[PDB]
Amino acid sequence: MRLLHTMLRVGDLQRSIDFYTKVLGMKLLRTSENPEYKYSLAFVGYGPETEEAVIELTYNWGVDKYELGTAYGHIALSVDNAAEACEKIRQNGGNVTREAGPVKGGTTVIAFVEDPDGYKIELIEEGN
Amino acid sequence: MRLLHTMLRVGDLQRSIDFYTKVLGMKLLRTSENPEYKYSLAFVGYGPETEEAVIELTYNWGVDKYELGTAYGHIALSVDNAAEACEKIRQNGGNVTREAGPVKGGTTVIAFVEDPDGYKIELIEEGN
Numbered sequence: 075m076r077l078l079h080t081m082l083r084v085g086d087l088q089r090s091i092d093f094y095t096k097v098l099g100m101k102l103l104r105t106s107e108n109p110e111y112k113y114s115l116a117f118v119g120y121g122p123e124t125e126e127a128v129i130e131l132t133y134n135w136g137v138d139k140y141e142l143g144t145a146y147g148h149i150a151l152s153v154d155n156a157a158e159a160c161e162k163i164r165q166n167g168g169n170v171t172r173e174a175g176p177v178k179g180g181t182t183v184i185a186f187v188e189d190p191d192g193y194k195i196e197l198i199e200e201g202n
Numbered sequence: 203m204r205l206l207h208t209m210l211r212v213g214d215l216q217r218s219i220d221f222y223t224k225v226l227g228m229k230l231l232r233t234s235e236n237p238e239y240k241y242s243l244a245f246v247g248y249g250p251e252t253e254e255a256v257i258e259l260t261y262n263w264g265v266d267k268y269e270l271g272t273a274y275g276h277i278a279l280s281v282d283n284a285a286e287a288c289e290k291i292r293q294n295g296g297n298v299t300r301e302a303g304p305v306k307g308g309t310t311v312i313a314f315v316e317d318p319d320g321y322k323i324e325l326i327e328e329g330n
Contacts, residue, residue, distance in 0.1 A: 075227055075282060076248050077255045078326060080208045081275030099203055120204050127205050127255035132275055143271020145319070147209030147260060154203070191273070198206060 077127040079117065080149060082193055083140050087114055087133035089167065089190050094118040094129065097166045098151065098159075103128060112136075140191075148186070148194035156185045156199045163187045174199075205255040207245065208277060211268050212319050215242050215261035217295070221318050222246040222257065225294045226279065226287075231256060240264070268319070276314075276322035284311045284327040291315050302327075 084090040094100045100118040107114040112135040119128030129149065153159045156174035164170045164187075171194070172186035183199035212218040222228040228246040235242050240263040247256030257277065281287045284302035292298050299322070300314035311327040 075280050077208075077257070078278040078280055078324075078328075080277050081324075083273050083275055129205070130275065130278070140273035141269075141271040142273045143269045145211050145268035145270045145321070146274035147211055147258070149208050150206040150258070152204050152206055193273070196206075196209075 078123070079119075079128045079130045081130040081132055082191070083132045083134065083137075084191050085133075085138035085140070086190070087116055087131065090131045090133075091116050091118065093167050093190050094131070097162055097168065100129070142192055146193075148196050150196035150198055152200055153197045154200055156183050156197045159197055160185050160187065206251070207247075207256045207258045209258040209260060210319075210321060211260045211262065211265075213261075213266035213268070214318065215244055215259060217318050218259045218261075219244050219246065221295060222259075225290055225296065227282075228257075270320060274321075276324050278324035278326055280328040281313075281325040282327075284313050284325050287325055288313050288315065 091102055095102055095118060100120055103117040103119055103123060105116045114133045116131040117123060117128050118131060119126055160170050160174050167190045169188040171188060174183060174185040176182060177184050185197040187195050189195060219230055223230055223246060228248055231245040231247055231251060233244045242261045244259040245256050288298045288302050295318050297316040299316060302311055302313040305312045313325045315323050317323060
C-alpha cells in the first residue's frame with residue numbers, strides 16, 4: 075500500500091497550478107473537470123502518480139475562499155537550497171513565515187512558507 | 203525534490219498511531235518529544251521516509267480538539283482490499299462515509315472513511 079496524494083481545496087486553480095509548477099518545480103500531471111459536481115482537479119507532483127505521492131488541487135466552481143482551520147498542519151518538501159526557494163516563493167505569489175535556517179538543536183536547514191491560498195509548506199534542505 | 207510528508211494535528215497521539223498502524227497497515231517509523239514546546243510527534247507510513255512520503259502526526263500536550271476547517275481535503279491511500287478495510291475500520295474507531303464500491307463512471311473500487319480525529323481518508327483499490 076502507499077500514500078497516493080494529499081488533496082487541498084484552492085480558490086483559484088491556475089493560480090495554484092502556477093505556484094506548484096513554476097515556483098516549486100513540480101509538474102502538472104493531469105487535470106479533470108466534473109460537471110455534475112461542479113469542480114475541476116489538478117494533480118501536481120515531482121514524479122508520476124504511479125511512482126510517488128502527489129498533491130491534488132481541487133477547484134470548486136465559483137468558490138474562491140475556504141476556512142483553513144487549525145487542524146491541518148502542512149506539507150513538507152525537500153529542496154536543494156532553502157534560501158533560494160524562499161526568495162523565489164516570496165516573489166511569486168507565496169509568503170515566507172519562517173526564514174531558512176537550521177533547526178534549533180540541529181543542523182538541518184528548514185523554512186516555512188505559505189502558498190497562494192495560505193496553506194503552510196515546510197521546506198527541508200537536502201566548503202562554501 | 204520530493205514530497206516528504208503531510209502533517210496533521212491530532213487530539214490523541216497513541217489513538218492516532220494505533221489507527222494508522224493497526225487499522226491502515228502503516229508502520230511507526232519514528233517518534234519524538236519536545237518538552238520545551240510541549241508536543242509529541244509521530245511519523246507513520248508504508249515505507250522508509252528516505253524513499254517515500256509519509257504522514258506526520260502532531261500532538262500538542264493538553265490539546266484534544268481542533269477546528270477542521272473547510273480547506274483541507276483528505277489523504278488518499280492505496281488499499282489491498284477496500285471492502286475488507288472498510289470493515290476493519292468500521293469496527294476499529296473509524297467511520298465509513300462511503301462504502302467500498304466502483305467509482306462513478308468507472309470500475310476502480312474506492313471508499314471514504316474518517317480517522318479518529320475526523321480527518322477524511324480516501325481508499326483506492328489499486329517500469330515494471
